[PDB]
Amino acid sequence: SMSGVEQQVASLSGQCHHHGENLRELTTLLQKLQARVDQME
Amino acid sequence: SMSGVEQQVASLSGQCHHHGENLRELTTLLQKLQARVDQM
Amino acid sequence: SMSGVEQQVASLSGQCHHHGENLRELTTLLQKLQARVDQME
């Protein structure tokens, strides 16, 4: 059972990392969209 | 407790999937707003 | 080991929650941008 938890924790860590990289990319795109909107005003 | 840790990991797996759902929703709303800015 | 696994689970739990707070942050900036763009049309 211990080894099964270790493997699922590793799976959760990879998904957690993937979500973190997606957050950073969405943050970049949002900041680019903010600048375009401000330039259009 | 092995069972206890197993239930915590199932909890985190659920929060993970929920976060993944929120990311997809935020991505779709960003694409719609970006298209609205392009149309202007 | 069971305590070592409880800690990694605790690591991940902290990150998940940080991720939630970043999602809420981005949702809010997106909602303010949506309003801003609505005022430009």
Author numbering:
A (entry chain C), C (entry chain B): 361 to 401
B (entry chain A): 361 to 400
Can I see the authors' text?
The LINC complex, consisting of interacting SUN and KASH proteins, mechanically couples nuclear contents to the cytoskeleton. The SUN protein has an N-terminal nuclear region, crosses the inner nuclear membrane, and then traverses the nuclear lumen (perinuclear space) to position its C-terminal SUN domain immediately below the outer nuclear membrane. The luminal region of SUN proteins upstream of the SUN domain is thought to consist of a long trimeric coiled-coil that passes between nuclear membranes.
On the basis of conservation and secondary structure prediction, we identified a 40 amino-acid coiled-coil domain towards the beginning of human SUN1’s luminal region (amino-acids 362–401; herein referred to as α1), which was stable in solution following recombinant expression. At the centre of the SUN1 α1 coiled-coil structure is a 376-CHHH-379 motif, in which the cysteine residues are at the “a” position of the heptad repeat and are oriented away from the coiled-coil axis. We observed additional electron density for one cysteine of the trimer, which points towards the coiled-coil axis, likely representing an oxidised cysteine residue. The oxidised C376 residue is packed within the core of the structure, so likely provided additional stability to the coiled-coil, and may have assisted the formation of a robust crystal system suitable for X-ray diffraction. The trimeric coiled-coil on the N-terminal side is formed by heptad amino-acids V365, V369 and L372, whilst the coiled-coil on the C-terminal side is formed by heptad residues L386, L390, L393, V397 and M400. Further, the crystal structure lacked bound zinc, but included a partially oxidised cysteine residue, which seemingly provided an alternative means for structural stabilisation.
